[PDB]
Symmetry: C5
Subunit: 207 residues, 5 copies
């Protein structure tokens, strides 16, 4: 489009930085922020069948909308890159995580003109999950829950992205492991409930 | 009230109010009474136990609550609670006497402030400890004791009191651990110029068999 | 010119000028053409190679140049170039897709800004990758392919150019490494599109 | 006095006064005398002793006290002392000469300031050292010597001294450690040099320990 | 003069003067001539050595000095030197060409500034290098060569210059012992000045 007008872009960043409240949930019309999450698996590095611990690399594709960040893009760029400190991101956490997320990519989000925000960092992290079955035909099934840490369902709703296929599409052919199946469903932990996305990852050692 | 809880402007004003009254470095001491801090550990995972060196590597949710009345607001027609970055608030300077590594916070550092002045902060922590691991293979199991207390504030300034005194822990403990939990007991204890209050947390566990 | 290179106050003023003009978070897109970024990997060392898990641990110099002509100045009687802290300038958000650890930067985070608007940033980096190491014992060696692109900017926004392939490397590679380089190959490639430079390192053990 | 310790507005106002007087980067030399810094190490654990490479990994409470009287206030009806983030205070630049890892601080970084201008900062620290490890498995035990002094300030500027209570630390150290401690001594020492024409004061700490059996 | 070293207000004011005139991000070239930086490595310990992978883990005090005359003051009745956080000061962007890990700094990061404009910064560093360890178990030992110079400033802008067996500082408890340390100038190619430090050392026993 006009995507390459430096001044247009600098002005958009300015508008965003002035409207954006990095610490307040972008609720609209008094309804929960609808965040969407999807893990896209990239690698499985170490698996310990005795301790039941896995070390994985995945794209943590996250999206939501903040309509106040929107702008007329008839003759201005349709989207820009924004550093995540200038923005609100949802406070996601892996319930069965046993190491800090190690973010391997630049910490930038895209804000689209309609007001949609997308953050997709590439993350390496260790989890605690059922590893039993990893050396058989039918493999192991390790389950990861990603939800809001401090915000309950009425404040934030965490759903899976429309597309869960291609989940294993960018998975490294040089892993000692192979993905048999991935499912990504809604779930709610528990007076207040926290929504999360349960990722079931069915994988096996390459025989 | 629930009706007005997702009003963004209201949420932003509460954040502003709190950042104005909040003294992150001063204890929220009230009426010349010690700040009463409730600490409760909910164990999530036991990862690496060593029977020789007597060390363990645990993961627990540190449920911490206390009250700052001065952060209170009316809450009838605004949401009662909000998330606040903890750098904006006073949090107690708890430490574990027998920790042998830094606590690794695995969750976003956010507290919840309630309209009545109550502050709730519950990080997930992975930390190593020095404690009694002997008898871990045996049916009745090792009993590792963790002592968590205020680090610079003596007992006339901060009091620590544990909210759940006994349980199985069944709710939160990973079913995929090598270990099982028999009992968790938490007692208010004390150690002394002046006095420091703590919570002795006794984790009774054994290797599954 | 070269004779006024060491004039201290002339340097202070260029820095000041740069800091007043530079927009560290906006792509320096000139004349509605995507920022053309030059990348060259110049291998220094291979530290550890794992044939079981197919991970490799490498030390390289990431030679990176691009142009921001709004940063240019008249050097008739002032220095030709200066060093700027990387926080004062915009920097391409490059990422390695098959990276499995955070890029550990071994050098000072200083760039060079040339009086014509050229920015040169070349950090020394250590980083682990997941790549095909089968054959590293073998005389014809293994070939590890590292794919580096801009993480958030598509092709109309940022374009990657790699020079030169395959000419390096024998110049900077450690003679004391257990490994030796047979060849290096740096090629353009793409995937709206994300341009990237695929680097192919042909190496083998010594015997 | 002690009956006003939980006066919040007093504590807050004392913090205000301290942050206004305090020069975090300037040594608190009163009356052209060196700052008298007291250090004492109180050992909590020994975790890894490497017989091959002569390395120890230890956990100790590094007890540090000094005086800065400009920060002093009246104790007449404000709290005797308060806690302060160390970024608000000057802290002496202690280093261990035989440290081979960075100091890993296990505790909150708050110091205590007393109404008479006394400042105490006691972090729990886990750190690796390079010292003689031979004997660890014998009756007599190994003896590792740790020197802690000021890195940049010479003896005219800062004096480093051991503390009046020097039994410590024997009692605290965990009963669960593989090791046990035979003796601890903390003697004042003073290294001079060809590098620099001035003398750096320090405390030499001698830790005598053996494996249990 | 020493007499007034411990005047606190004199100290605070010197530090105020330094921070007011110091330009942390600009080379203190004087009189159209390159900054002359003094570098000397003082070996303290050698921890891990791998003759197979040719890798070495060392601890050394890095002595670094240079001049910025604009920092000079009149010390007639004030302190001769004071300590300054390096974030208030320009420091040379030195890098080890053959290093394979970040320099882990173990000491507090302060410089000393002398009333005549001399700046001394000497941090203790544990770093790992990629160097020839062949022949370490032998009586003549390995010779490991480390190369340090300005990472972004060519010769025209910064010169580095050397200034032993390091018996003074080296650990008696190291598995290893030092035969000889030599420090010589070298250039690499516009060109960069560096100091080659050659460490010659063997196993003990
Ligand atoms: C059956 C699901 C397995 C996962 C175990 C979760 C049990 C407890 N559920 C919670 C509690 C909180 C929580 C965190 C912090 C608070 O205060 C800051 C309050 C609640 N947050 C989430 N996402 N799940
Ligand atoms: C036996 C001799 C060993 C010498 C081998 C090293 C050759 C590499 N040359 C360089 C390049 C740069 C450099 C760094 C950054 C730039 O732009 C940001 C430009 C050049 N800096 C130095 N000190 N040596
Ligand atoms: C034939 C070899 C394929 C290997 C690489 C596969 C390319 C995958 N696609 C993407 C997506 C994004 C992306 C990143 C962040 C976003 O939002 C913040 C959106 C897209 N960025 C890049 N460079 N490639
Ligand atoms: C295994 C360890 C043996 C090492 C022996 C220790 C010798 C003591 N020498 C010094 C020098 C300096 C010093 C530091 C920086 C300077 O300028 C910035 C000058 C001197 N500071 C102290 N505390 N001890
Ligand atoms: C292996 C575990 C050993 C446990 C022994 C318990 C001894 C209690 N000692 C202290 C000292 C301080 C303390 C810390 C810092 C100070 O000044 C900054 C003052 C006192 N605080 C507490 N809660 N207990
Ligand atoms: C935005 O601005 C254009 C240009 O004037 C205008 O025609 C258009 O109606 C606006 N777009 C929307 C969706 O309102
Ligand atoms: C606000 O709070 C007070 C309680 O102090 C209550 O009387 C009042 O009705 C509430 N009304 C509001 C804010 O509408
Ligand atoms: C650059 O500056 C010099 C010296 O003033 C001048 O002679 C020359 O014409 C200038 N060039 C431009 C493009 O301004
Ligand atoms: C402290 O204030 C009291 C009154 O509470 C006064 O009597 C006393 O003289 C004061 N002391 C100092 C140090 O000024
Ligand atoms: C500063 O130093 C010069 C040295 O010649 C001397 O003339 C002058 O009196 C000094 N100033 C002070 C503070 O006395």
């Amino acid at each position: 489009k006009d995507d390459d007008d430096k001044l247009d872009r600098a002005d958009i960043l300015y508008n965003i930085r002035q409207t954006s409240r990095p610490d307040v949930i972008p609720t609209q019309r008094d309804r929960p922020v609808a965040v969407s999450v999807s893990l896209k698996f990239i690698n499985i590095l170490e698996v310990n069948e005795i301790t039941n611990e896995v070390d994985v690399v995945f794209w943590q594709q996250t999206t939501w909308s903040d309509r106040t960040l929107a702008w007329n893009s008839s003759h201005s760029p349709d989207q820009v890159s924004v550093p995540i400190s200038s923005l609100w991101v949802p406070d996601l956490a892996a319930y069965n995580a046993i190491s800090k997320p190690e973010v391997l990519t630049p910490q930038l989000a895209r804000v689209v003109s309609d007001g949609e925000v997308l953050y997709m960092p590439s993350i390496r992290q260790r989890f605690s999950c059922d590893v039993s079955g990893v050396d058989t035909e039918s493999g192991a099934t390790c389950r990861i829950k990603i939800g809001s840490w401090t915000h309950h369902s009425r404040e934030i709703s965490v759903d899976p992205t429309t597309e869960n296929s291609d989940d294993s599409e960018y998975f490294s052919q040089y892993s000692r492991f192979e993905i048999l199946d991935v499912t990504q469903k809604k779930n709610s932990v528990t007076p207040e409930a926290y929504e999360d996305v349960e990722v079931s990852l069915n994988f096996r050692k390459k025989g």
